[PDB]
Structure formats: C-alpha cells, structure tokens
Amino acid sequence: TPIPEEVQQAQTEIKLFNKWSFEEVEVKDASLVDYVQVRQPIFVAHTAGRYANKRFRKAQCPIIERLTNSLMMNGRNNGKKLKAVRIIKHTLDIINVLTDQNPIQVVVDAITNTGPREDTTRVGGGGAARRQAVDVSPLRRVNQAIALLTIGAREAAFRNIKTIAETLAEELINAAKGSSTSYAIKKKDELERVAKSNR
Amino acid sequence: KKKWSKKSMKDRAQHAVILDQEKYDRILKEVPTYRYVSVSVLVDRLKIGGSLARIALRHLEKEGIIKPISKHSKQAIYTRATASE
Amino acid sequence: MPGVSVRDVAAQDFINAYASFLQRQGKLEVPGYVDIVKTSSGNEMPPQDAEGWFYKRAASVARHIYMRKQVGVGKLNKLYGGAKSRGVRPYKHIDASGSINRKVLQALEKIGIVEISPKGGRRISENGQRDLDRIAAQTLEEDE
Amino acid sequence: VADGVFYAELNEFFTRELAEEGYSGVEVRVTPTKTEVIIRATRTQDVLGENGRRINELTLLVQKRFKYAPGTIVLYAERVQDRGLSAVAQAESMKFKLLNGLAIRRAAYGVVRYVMESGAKGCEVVVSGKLRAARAKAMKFADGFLIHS
Amino acid sequence: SHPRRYGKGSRQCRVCSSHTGLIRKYGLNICRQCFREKANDIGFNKFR
Amino acid sequence: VEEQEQQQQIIKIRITLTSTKVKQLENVSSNIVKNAEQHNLVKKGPVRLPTKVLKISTRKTPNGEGSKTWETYEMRIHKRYIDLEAPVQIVKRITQITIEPGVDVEVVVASN
Amino acid sequence: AVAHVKAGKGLIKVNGSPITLVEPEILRFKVYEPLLLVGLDKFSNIDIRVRVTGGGHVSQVYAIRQAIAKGLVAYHQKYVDEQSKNELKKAFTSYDRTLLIADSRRPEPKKFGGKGARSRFQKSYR
Amino acid sequence: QNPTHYKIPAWFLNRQNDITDGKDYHTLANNVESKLRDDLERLKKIRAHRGIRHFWGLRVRGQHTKTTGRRRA
RNA sequence: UAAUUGCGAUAACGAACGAGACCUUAACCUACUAAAUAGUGGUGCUAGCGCUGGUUAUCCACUUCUUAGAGGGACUAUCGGUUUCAAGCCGAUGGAAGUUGAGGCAAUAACAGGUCUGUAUGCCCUUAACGUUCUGGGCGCACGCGCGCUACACUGACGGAGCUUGGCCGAGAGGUCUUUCCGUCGUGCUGGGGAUAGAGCAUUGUAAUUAUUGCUCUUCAACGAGGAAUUCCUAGUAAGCGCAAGUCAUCAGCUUGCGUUGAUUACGUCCUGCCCUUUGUACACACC
C-alpha cells in the first residue's frame, strides 16, 4: 500500500526538474536544430565520452547540461555543482515567470541569436598577420553562445547587487528578445561585423 | 566612492517607503506586466534592497494580495494574483 | 510513521520542530562561558535564543543520537566542526569545540537524558528516546 | 611492521659479515632461537673446526643484535649447485685477479666464457674505467641473452 | 675526565656517518635507499 | 573462547597461528599443509584466513643532485595469514611444531 | 521469502537491495526515502520505475547506501530492482531494455606520478 | 567602556612599575591606541630587544627578506 | 604502427637488445573455491500508534565488503564494408576496444653533466693536526631571482547547524582521579585581508631573544584579480578541499602517498624538443 511521491496520477510523466517539457521546444534554425539534441532529456546530468569525431554530426549534447557546467566554471574558481544546479533550477523558473513560456524554449532562442554566422581567426602568413574570416562549426556556435551568455551573467553579478540566477535569466531573456543590452548578442553582432568586413 | 541609497532598515521603519509607496508602486505595479517575477529579479529592477523587499512581500502575503513559493537562498517566486480554477 | 520518523526525516525540519519542545526545559544555563568567542571568529550568542548556539546543539545531538550512538564528548565536537590544516596564512575556522560540547552534555545529564559509559561514550536512555519519539508524533502530521 | 622489523635488521648484518671473505653465499632461515645459516662454501673450513669456537662463532655472531633468546645455535655445511645465481666467490674470483693483475680485457672475456659454457643464457661483465690508469672509458661486453630489465 | 652531555636526538646507521635519517628500520636517509633494495624487511622488492 | 574437547578435560584451546612472508607463492603452500593435519588428527579445524595488507611505499629522489623528475621506484606489499584450529590438543601442537616448512615464513605459536 | 540481489554499481557507493514484495514504501539507510532525501530532483530519478511501469504495489525496495558524496549513488540502486524482476517475468524483459540504464565511468581516482603537483601536473617553470 | 557584571581593576602588589597589564584594558579605543605609544617608550627604558628595535626602527619580529616590504616604504 | 612493431619486397640469411608480451594495479565481473574480519537475517530492551523502525546479544548462514586463487582477460574466429596485398578506417554485443589506461620492467654510449658534504678508493694537506669533546652564536639584508602560501571577496565573508580516549574539568593552548539549512552580510579596500607592532600565558627543551609552535588581546599593512611575460594539462586528467605517512626534542612544508570535489580544449605538426631517409658540408671537444 502506497504512500509515495506526489506527481500526477499518471500519464506520460514530464520530468526535467519535474516541472517542464522538452519536446515542445523548437529550434527554428534548420542547421542548428540538428546539433541540438532534445530527443529525451530530463535534468539530472551525466558524462559520456562520445569522442571528438569530425565532419559529420559529432556527438550527443543536452543544451541544459552545457549551461549548468559553464556556470560552475566561468568564473573564475571555486564553484560547486550542488550550488550550480541550484541556481539554474531557480533560473529556469525565473525565465518562465518572466516570459510565460517554457524555459528550454527561451534558452534555445537565446543561444540561436547569440551564435554568430562567422568568426575571425588570426593567421600569420608571409610577413604579416591577417584575419580572413573563419568557419563557425555548428557545436562551436553553441559553445561560444553559452560561454558568452555565461560571462555576461557573471559580469553583472559581480558588479551589481543581484544573485546569479536573476543575472543569468536577465542576460538570457535579453538575448532571447534580440536586445543589445545583453552581453551575448552584443558580442555576436561584433564578431559577425568583424568577420564579414575582414575579407 | 559613488554613493548610496535605498539602504534599509531605517527607511523601512520610517513611513516613507513602508506605508504605501513601495509596496503599491514597486511590488504591485510590476505584477500586471508579469504574473510572476522572482524575488531577486524584482530586487534588482525596482532598486529596492533584498531585505527591504522581503518584509514588504511578507506584509503583502498576510493580506493575501500576493502569494510566494520558496527556495533556500531566500530566493523563490513572487506572484500576485490568480484565477478561477 | 511517527517513531520511525525520529529516524527518518530530513534533519532540519526535525531540529526546527524539536527546538520548541526543548524550550520548555528549566535548564539551559549558559553561565558566561559563551561570551568570549566560542568558535572560529564571529561566534557570539544573541541570535542564539530561537535555535542558536546552544539550543540547536542540544536538539539535533539528540536527533543524531537516536540513529547512531555511542558517542562521547569527542565525537560531538567535530561532527559539526572543522580545524583544517592551514596553508599557514588561513584559518578557515577554529571550531574549538571542547567548551561547547561540555555545556550541552552537562544539561542533559541533569534532566536524565544521557548516560555515561566507562569505555563506550554517551548512550541514550529510556527517558531520552521517550521525549524524542513522543514529540515526533506531532511532527509528521504538519509535514504532510 | 614489527615482525618485518625483526626481518629488517637481520639480512644486512648477514651481508656485512658475509662480504669480502673467500666463501660462497648465505641464506638464513629463522626458527625460534636458532638460525639455520647455510653457507655454500669450500672455505667453510675457516668458519668451522668443531667444538673449539669457530663454527659457532660467525653464527652466534648473528645472536646479539635484534634476535634472540638464551640458547645455542646450529650451522649446516653445504655444497654449491652452480655458482652463478648466488655466491660471493663469483664476485671474489674476479676481485683476486683484479688485485695484482692480468690483462683486464682478458679477465672480462674469460669470466663470461666459463659461465656461458655452463649454459647461463647470458652473462654480462662490466669493468670500471681507469684501464691502464688512464681516464674513465668504462666498459661493457656481454655475450648471449641476459636481461636484468 | 669529568662528564658531559647534550645533543641527544635520533639515530642513524653505523654503515653511514650522517645524523639525519629515518628511524623505523634504523638507518640514515640514503642508507635506507641502499637498504630498500634489500628486503630484510617484509616488503620492498622493488619497484612500486 | 575455548573450544571444548579428556586429559583431565582440555582447558587450553586459544591458538592463533600468524604466518607472515615475503613471497605469496611459498607461503600458501605451507599454509595448505596446516589445514590438512587438523582434519586427520581427530577433529577438524578451519582453513586459511588472509586479512589485510601492510604497505610502506616510500618515495625518494635518488639522488643526483638534482633529480627533479623521474624517481626510481620501490614497493612493499605484504600479507598476514591467520590460521586457527577448532581444537588445540597436545598432539596437535607437537606435529605442527616438529615439521614446519617455513623458509622465510615466520610462524609464531601464540598464546594461552 | 523472496530476496533477489544482483548488484550493479557504477560510480562509488554500494547498494545492496533485498526485496520482499509488498507495498511501495522505500527505505534508504533503512530510513524513509522522500523524507531523507530532500535535496532532490535527482532523487525522484529512482522513483520513476516504481511508478511508470503500472506496477506500484509489487516493490518494497530496501536499499542501503553507505559512503561517498551524495550524487554518485543513484545509478547503482536502480539496477538491482530491474534485474530481479527480469528473472521472474521474462516478458517484462522490455522494462530493463526500454527504461535505459548503464554506465558508471568506473575510473576512480587515477595514479600519482611524482613531481606532478597533484599527479602529472608537472609545475611550472621555464 | 565598562559594564555591570564584568569589570577589571588593576591589582598586584607594588611595584613592578612599567609596563604592567592594568588587567587587560577594554578600555579599548583611544586608551588602547595611546597606551601602546607609552608601552613602546616603556619597552625602550626596559632595554628590551623589543625596545632596541623600537629604537632601530626596523620590522619588529624579524620578517623574511627574500622578498617583501616594497609597498610599505 | 608509440614501436627495424609486424608484413610485403630486397645481395642476403640470420642473431642480441630496447619496445611489446612479461609483472604491477586503478579499473572490472563474479556468478564462484576458500575463510572470517564485516554486511545481512532470528532474539531481547522499547517508541510510534513483533504492525513500523533503533540498539546490542550468541562464531547460526550465504555475500557485493575482505582477501588468496580461480576462471571470465574482450578480441575484427564472431555478424560487417570498397579493396596489389598483410593492413588501415568506423561499428555490434559487452563492462572497456586492436596503441583497453598509467608509464612505474626503459637499449648501449655519450655530457670531463652532477655528487669527494646523500657512498667507498687513488693521492697531497698531513700525522698524540682541516684530531678531539663541546659551549654559546650565526641559515642580518638599501636590491635580483626562483619555487611555494594566502588574498583581492557571493561560485564569498560569520556564526550554528548536516599513539589515542572514556569523563569530571578549561579563554585558547590544556591538567587528570582514571581505561549542506539559516541569524548575519549589502558587493563594503569593509562584517574583505591578515601583514606588522606591543604587552602577557602554556608546552616542547637546559635554554625560545638574532632562530619554537599554539595566542588571550589589541594594532588593523600592502593588495580593487596582476605588466614586458610563463608553466602544464588530452576526462576522474587540468584546477580546487583536506588528511596521514616520513621529516621531527621543536619547526613555517619539504618531499610524499591515500581519498574527497570536479572542468574545458584534444583537429594536427599549421615557436620548441625528436625520428628516420634525403643532399650539401670548408665543421669534427662539433653553429657557443
């Protein structure tokens, strides 16, 4: 005889903190969508050493997993995962609360906007150093997107009287709505400015 | 330094922010744009202190005008209103 | 469900519930020892009154005891506390905890809660489990 | 630890007495208050010699350090089963030629030559630099297999 | 003729003449490396 | 405490036999023999119990000087083999002591 | 009685589960599961498979977790309950298969070469 | 500056004269800061090393010299 | 291909040796043969209100713990692909893939490397002296260089909460009759940081002052994340929290191992070290 966990007395049970659904989330960009896996996550975590393999579609990824991990990290020093998950658990809820839309969908929207079209590697050749503009490679767009969004959130927390979760929500929403106030979009638009020009 | 105000508790005690102005303007006015907003986002936008927003939320809670939920870092969400369900 | 709940709730909701019951005991004499700095560097007592210094230290120790046992003055002291080797610029903390432990343990002896071994440490009595378990009865109903 | 400590004093003290001496190799096996002390020596005559003192004396020589007990001891004489795998004579015979001399290059070749005839699979001799009192060349020379490592 | 003392302290082999050393076994800290090959003690044969 | 078995009633039994060697291969074999003897004798004792490990692994710069990587490398594992009998007769003590295969195996009869 | 213990593991912590089938109450350290464990979203992970399956009352899971870092644990506990059933119903084979499971990593802490500051982490100068 | 249940009066037989302890002055603030100024001259009239260093002018309790003190002066 | 590693050719046919295999073990699997340190079940003492669980009990069993062995070693027999040919490349299953992972078994010979003071031997100084046994004192420092240790502050800072004792008893340090939640923080050169200073107290020791450690207490120092610039690291690794061993009468942490926390990038050779072939060479203790 029961007692047990309270959820719904069931159906298919949506997990992802038990709060939100992943399947509804659309990646508009046809190119981008392929790399971004959301055919069947939750939020628990996991490593798996998928290996670098190149050219064709490389590995599995969860967007969320990447976002928590960047936060613990950047930065700099001395961040633990129990706090790092916690801040996101709350951040997702702040984001949902601001938008009235699925937090994963906003995360997607942020990342797709912040991920530039083109970049600007620095090559020495002959007697001088040129930038000819360089590939984006679809995971690297994603990685850069998250990193940029993540530095911005940190920068705000440090400077202003705000906990991370809100700085992270704010920076993400702002990117997710195409406003230059976010660090992440401002750098995207710069990086694509420089890459187009330097050709 | 630059300087420096909202600043609490002494402003909290005196009438100027506690009475009406802060609870009605800041907390209550924000809510019609977003049904819920987090206690900490709400701190930062309003420019109101975390401690300062916290008692105001609590008065409002008693009233039944707002309803909080929780989380440990005295973060949570703040909601006003809501319904027929 | 309740008795077993002494053992099986998350410690805090147990300690918070329990501390109000403790509050009733007559004892709770601190006599001025606490006042210097009991622990690392910002440890004083005025936040102590609700579930402080002293009162959580008792309430919980009792929560700990049920599950575990046997114990002693030593066992208690760092249970809570640090005193990590130092890269020699530090402290993190100095937890003393030699005075602290002694004060908590003393009160308990007067009421009759805790008993003293020759080799073993601190054991719980028939008296000690009774109060813990009986209060636990109230706790579970509130929670669910 | 401490049983090993008993162990931990005893062989090095066997090594230091069993050094330069003309003899051949020393196992020690320790029961309660006796040390077996098997020597594989021809020159076991010098250590032995019945009642007297001699036979006892190198063994009783074990007795003092760390080990053990009011008691007498025992010693057993033994033969050799092929000198190469352990001895002291294997070391010493080259040492006795390296005193007054002979051709050094010949001594290196010769010593390898005996044991390799006796099978060995490998023997390697190395001889210090300062040959003819010159610099230090240092010299190797090995025949067969032979593998320390 | 009278007597004397003071500069007591730890131990070292005879086999090596230096004071500084490791106590458990009873020789000095290189004498110990020479000894480590030997084995003598339960343990050390070699290598890691 | 005393595993009771005549002789004016045996009130002796408490043996602990602790066998400590350098080589595992050699130790095992000696150990095996102890177990068989108990069984033959009249009443059967228990088999080999081998518990836990003694390490000194001590990490030392050779030395040059300088030796600043790449140290040369040295391991003590060893092992303690603890064999009871269920019954300690007089006959049992004698057969085991008289014929003892220890070479490097250091076997201490201990203690009433 | 009924007691099937087939012991998984993957990451540190040892979960032995001897399962006597009755009511779906669950113990961990022999202490009730939702109440201790608290500090959760990842705890409810376990809880899926004593719900979604459509068998609720078929498992009193008795699980004893002893020893490491609260997180590592979760994978081990699950395997044992799934293998046991797979023996009896071999038809509910598509319950192990379809609800995922497995890895571990297994590679717990790595060797210490000298001079590396933590272990291979050479230090630090030209 | 001084409370009800706690209090500290200087006691001892006479002398030692200087410096003394005054039974742990609290009394902190000006009286502490202005106390050490005297305590230093007193420590000099002592002939302490601690007093000679006060006269020498150097880092008191012998700091390391491999590096340091570059902001200080 | 890490590998004259192995194959296919070849004026060669062999052959050693390093590599690999070998051992070690962190991983492992264990279903088991072995035994119990221990895990787990059955008592008995209660508490909720043998029903649900806590405790210890008697050598009563089997087992993940234990450990010694065994066997499972995992690899392109085995399902697979175009293809001089042997192959490479990628994939199933599994618990990891052809170098399963460490470099710890690392070749000879060199560099007048380095050690005469971590370990002896020539040979001079010299020889009842650079014997001798000490006692007292030295490892100060206008500046450079090195390693290391702590900070600048919210992923924080504070307090409380998740050779070794029992226990009366102590500001800390001690002596013995005696075997991760929540008050607090307001992003403040501060509740940051602990530098330096000064008085005074216990222990180690004969002594603590240049040369103990712990500090009650109080001075409250620079430093706002670090130039020109550097070092490693290829997933339990970088980086971070601590602990015990050795050191050791004392001693900053040395050096050193166990666990615990836990990330990012890993294409390639696109300044530096190297390998084999290649040509040229006026060099040959060798582009210093």
Swiss-Prot record, chain B:
Keywords associated with the record: Cytoplasm, Methylation, Ribonucleoprotein, Ribosomal protein
Principal subcellular localisation of the protein: cytoplasm
Location(s), subcellular: Cytoplasm
Record-annotated disulphide pairs: none
Biological process, per Gene Ontology: cytoplasmic translation
Signal peptide: none
Sequence ranges of Basic residues compositional bias: 1-7
GO CC annotations, alphabetized: cytosol; cytosolic small ribosomal subunit
GO MF annotation list: structural constituent of ribosome
Similarity annotation: Belongs to the eukaryotic ribosomal protein eS25 family.
Function: Component of the ribosome, a large ribonucleoprotein complex responsible for the synthesis of proteins in the cell. The small ribosomal subunit (SSU) binds messenger RNAs (mRNAs) and translates the encoded message by selecting cognate aminoacyl-transfer RNA (tRNA) molecules. The large subunit (LSU) contains the ribosomal catalytic site termed the peptidyl transferase center (PTC), which catalyzes the formation of peptide bonds, thereby polymerizing the amino acids delivered by tRNAs into a polypeptide chain.
Subunit description: Component of the small ribosomal subunit (SSU). Mature yeast ribosomes consist of a small (40S) and a large (60S) subunit. The 40S small subunit contains 1 molecule of ribosomal RNA (18S rRNA) and 33 different proteins (encoded by 57 genes). The large 60S subunit contains 3 rRNA molecules (25S, 5.8S and 5S rRNA) and 46 different proteins (encoded by 81 genes).
Name used for this protein in its record: Small ribosomal subunit protein eS25A
Lineage of source species: Eukaryota, Fungi, Dikarya, Ascomycota, Saccharomycotina
Full protein segment contained here: 24 to 108 of 108
UniProtKB/Swiss-Prot annotation, chain C:
GO-annotated molecular function: RNA binding; structural constituent of ribosome
InterPro entries: Ribosomal_eS19, Ribosomal_eS19_CS, WH-like_DNA-bd_sf, WH_DNA-bd_sf
Keyword Signal tagged: no
Superkingdom, natural source: Eukaryota
Record keywords, A-Z: Cytoplasm, Ribonucleoprotein, Ribosomal protein, Ribosome biogenesis
Disruption phenotype: Disruption of a single RPS19 gene reduces cell growth; a double disruption is lethal. Depletion experiments show the proteins are required for correct maturation of precursor rRNA to generate the 18S small rRNA. A specific site between the 18S and 5.8S precursors (site A2 in ETS1) is not cleaved in disruption mutants. Partially assembled ribosomes are retained in the nucleolus rather than being exported to the cytoplasm. All effects are exacerbated in the double disruption. Increases association of NOC4 with 20S/21S pre-rRNA, decreases association of ENP1, TSR1 and RIO2 with 20S/21S pre-rRNA.
Gene Ontology BP annotations: ribosomal small subunit assembly; ribosomal small subunit biogenesis; ribosomal subunit export from nucleus; translation
Subcellular location: Cytoplasm
GO cellular component: cytosol; cytosolic small ribosomal subunit
Principal location: cytoplasm
Misc. comment: Present with 29000 molecules/cell in log phase SD medium.
Protein family (similarity comment): Belongs to the eukaryotic ribosomal protein eS19 family.
Protein name as annotated: Small ribosomal subunit protein eS19A
Gene that encodes the chain: RPS19A
UniProtKB/Swiss-Prot annotation, chain D:
Stated name of the protein: Small ribosomal subunit protein uS3
Residue positions, PTM Omega-N-methylarginine: 135
Start and end residues of each KH type-2 domain: 10-81
Keywords in alphabetical order: Cytoplasm, Isopeptide bond, Methylation, Phosphoprotein, Ribonucleoprotein, Ribosomal protein, RNA-binding, Ubl conjugation
GO CC terms of this entry: 90S preribosome; cytoplasm; cytosol; cytosolic small ribosomal subunit; nucleus; preribosome, small subunit precursor
Modification sites for Phosphothreonine: 33, 59
Record's miscellaneous remark: Present with 146000 molecules/cell in log phase SD medium.
Subunit structure: Component of the small ribosomal subunit (SSU). Mature yeast ribosomes consist of a small (40S) and a large (60S) subunit. The 40S small subunit contains 1 molecule of ribosomal RNA (18S rRNA) and 33 different proteins (encoded by 57 genes). The large 60S subunit contains 3 rRNA molecules (25S, 5.8S and 5S rRNA) and 46 different proteins (encoded by 81 genes).
GO biological process: cytoplasmic translation; maintenance of translational fidelity; nonfunctional rRNA decay; ribosomal small subunit export from nucleus; ribosomal subunit export from nucleus
Domain of life assignment: Eukaryota
GO MF annotation list: DNA-(apurinic or apyrimidinic site) endonuclease activity; RNA binding; structural constituent of ribosome
Location within or outside the cell: Cytoplasm
UniProt family annotation: Belongs to the universal ribosomal protein uS3 family.
Positions spanned in the full protein: 12 to 160 of 240
Organism this protein belongs to: Saccharomyces cerevisiae (strain ATCC 204508 / S288c) (Baker's yeast)
Gene: RPS3
Phosphoserine modified-residue sites: 86, 118
Record cross-link Glycyl lysine isopeptide (Lys-Gly) (interchain with G-Cter in ubiquitin), residues: 95, 121, 130, 140
Principal location: cytoplasm
UniProtKB/Swiss-Prot annotation, chain H:
Similarity section: Belongs to the universal ribosomal protein uS13 family.
Gene Ontology cellular component annotations, sorted alphabetically: cytoplasm; cytosol; cytosolic small ribosomal subunit; mitochondrion; small ribosomal subunit
Name of the gene this protein is made from: RPS18A
Keywords of the record: Acetylation, Cytoplasm, Isopeptide bond, Methylation, Ribonucleoprotein, Ribosomal protein, RNA-binding, rRNA-binding, Ubl conjugation
One MF term in the entry's GO annotations: rRNA binding
SUBUNIT field: Component of the small ribosomal subunit (SSU). Mature yeast ribosomes consist of a small (40S) and a large (60S) subunit. The 40S small subunit contains 1 molecule of ribosomal RNA (18S rRNA) and 33 different proteins (encoded by 57 genes). The large 60S subunit contains 3 rRNA molecules (25S, 5.8S and 5S rRNA) and 46 different proteins (encoded by 81 genes).
Segment of the intact protein contained: 74 to 146 of 146
Domain of life of the native organism: Eukaryota
Function: Component of the ribosome, a large ribonucleoprotein complex responsible for the synthesis of proteins in the cell. The small ribosomal subunit (SSU) binds messenger RNAs (mRNAs) and translates the encoded message by selecting cognate aminoacyl-transfer RNA (tRNA) molecules. The large subunit (LSU) contains the ribosomal catalytic site termed the peptidyl transferase center (PTC), which catalyzes the formation of peptide bonds, thereby polymerizing the amino acids delivered by tRNAs into a polypeptide chain.
Placement of covalent cross-link Glycyl lysine isopeptide (Lys-Gly) (interchain with G-Cter in ubiquitin): 7, 23
Disulfide bonds listed in the record: none
Protein's UniProt name: Small ribosomal subunit protein uS13A
